Amino acid sequence: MLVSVIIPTYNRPERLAVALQSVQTLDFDSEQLEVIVVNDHGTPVDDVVEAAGRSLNVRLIDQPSQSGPSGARNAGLEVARGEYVAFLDDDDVFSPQHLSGTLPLLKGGADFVYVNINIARTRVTGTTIADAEVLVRLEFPYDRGLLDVTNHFAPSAVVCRSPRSAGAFFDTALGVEEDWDFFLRLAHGHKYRVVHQPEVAIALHRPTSDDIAALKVYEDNWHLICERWPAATERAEQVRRFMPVMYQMAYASFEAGVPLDHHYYERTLQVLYRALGDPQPSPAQVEDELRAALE
Ligand SMILES: O=c1ccn([C@@H]2O[C@H](COP(=O)(O)OP(=O)(O)O[C@H]3O[C@H](CO)[C@@H](O)[C@H](O)[C@H]3O)[C@@H](O)[C@H]2O)c(=O)[nH]1
Numbered sequence: 599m600l601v602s603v604i605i606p607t608y609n610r611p612e613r614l615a616v617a618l619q620s621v622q623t624l625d626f627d628s629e630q631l632e633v634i635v636v637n638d639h640g641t642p643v644d645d646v647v648e649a650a651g652r653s654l655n656v657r658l659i660d661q662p663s664q665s666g667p668s669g670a671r672n673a674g675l676e677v678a679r680g681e682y683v684a685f686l687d688d689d690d691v692f693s694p695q696h697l698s699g700t701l702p703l704l705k706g707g708a709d710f711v712y713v714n715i716n717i718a719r720t721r722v723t724g725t726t727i728a729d730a731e732v733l734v735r736l737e738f739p740y741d742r743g744l745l746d747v748t749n750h751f752a753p754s755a756v757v758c759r760s761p762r763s764a765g766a767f768f769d770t771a772l773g774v775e776e777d778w779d780f781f782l783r784l785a786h787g788h789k790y791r792v793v794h795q796p797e798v799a800i801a802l803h804r805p806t807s808d809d810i811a812a813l814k815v816y817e818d819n820w821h822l823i824c825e826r827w828p829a830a831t832e833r834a835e836q837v838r839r840f841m842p843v844m845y846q847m848a849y850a851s852f853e854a855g856v857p858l859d860h861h862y863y864e865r866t867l868q869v870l871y872r873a874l875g876d877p878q879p880s881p882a883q884v885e886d887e888l889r890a891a892l893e
C-alpha cells in the first residue's frame with residue numbers, strides 16, 4: 599500500500615536472500631509494504647522467496663524470457679501498488695533507515711529521493727553495512743546537474759512516486775545505463791522533483807578485447823541517452839564534452855594493455871562535479887584531472 603520494493607533477480611538465489619533479509623530488517627511498519635521479486639528466467643528462487651514471505655507480503659513473478667533488468671523491473675513497476683516504489687538489486691542491501699529516512703521527504707512533496715551509496719568491496723548484510731571495506735562513496739548533492747552529464751547513482755538508492763501511475767517505464771532496448779535513461783525519464787520527461795537524502799546509505803556490491811568492446815557499449819548508450827535528453831543547464835551541456843575525452847583515454851589505455859584505476863568512473867564523477875561548480879576550471883585543467891582519475 600505505501601511502499602513496493604521491486605527486486606529483479608537472475609541466477610543469484612543466495613544474494614537475493616541477503617537483499618530480502620535487508621528488507622525484513624527495515625525500520626518500517628510491514629503492513630504498509632509489499633515486496634515484488636522478478637525472476638528474469640533464471641534458476642528458480644521459490645524456496646528462497648517462500649522463506650522471507652513468512653514475514654513480508656511477498657510476490658514472485660516469473661518472466662517468460664530473460665528480458666534484461668529493464669524488462670524485469672518493468673514487470674515489477676506494472677503490479678506495484680505502493681504510492682512509492684523502492685528498487686533493490688539482488689546483490690545490494692538496504693540500511694534499516696532506507697524508508698524511514700526517505701518517505702518523509704516524499705510525503706512532504708518530493709517525487710524522487712536518492713540516498714548515499716557505499717561501494718562495497720566486501721559482501722555485507724543490511725545491519726552490518728558499516729562493517730565493510732568501503733572502496734568509494736557516491737554522495738554528490740543535486741545542486742549542479744551532475745545527473746545531466748552522466749549517471750551518479752543506482753536504482754538501489756532510489757525511492758520514487760509510483761512510475762506506473764506516471765506511465766514511466768524502463769527502456770528495454772538498453773542493457774546498460776538503462777537506469778540513467780530512466781532517471782532522466784522521471785526528472786525531465788515527467789518533471790519529478792529530485793531530492794538527495796545524504797543521511798541514509800546503501801551498500802552497493804560491485805582481457806583488453808573484452809574491455810574495449812564493453813566500454814564501447816557504454817559510450818554508445820551514453821550518446822544515445824544524451825541525445826534523447828538534452829541537459830537542463832548550459833554548463834552541464836558543456837561538461838558532457840569531457841565524457842568522450844574520458845572514453846578516448848580509457849580506450850588508449852586498454853589498447854596499450856594498461857589497466858585503469860579500480861574506480862576510474864567514480865573518480866571521474868568527482869572531476870565532472872568540480873567542473874560544474876562556482877569557480878570554473880579551464881578545459882586543459884579538467885583534462886589533467888581526468889588523467890589522474892584514470893591513472
Ligand atoms: O539479465 C539480467 C541481469 C541482471 N538482472 C538483475 O538486475 C540487477 C542489476 O544487475 P547487476 O549485474 O547487479 O548490475 P550492475 O552491474 O550492478 O549494474 C548494472 O545495472 C545497474 C542497476 O543495477 C546500472 O546502474 C548499470 O548500468 C549496470 O552496470 C540485479 O537485481 C540483477 O539480478 C536481471 O534482472 N536480469
Ligand SMILES: Nc1ncnc2c1ncn2[C@@H]1O[C@H](CO)[C@@H](O)[C@@H]1O
Nearest residue numbers: 748749775778813816817820862863
Ligand atoms: N556513462 C557511464 N555510466 C555508467 N557506467 C559507465 C559509463 N561509461 C562507462 N561505464 C562503465 O560501466 C561501469 C560503471 O560502473 C564500468 O564498467 C565503466 O565505467
Ligand SMILES: [Mg+2]
Nearest residue numbers: 687689803804
Ligand atoms: Mg549489482
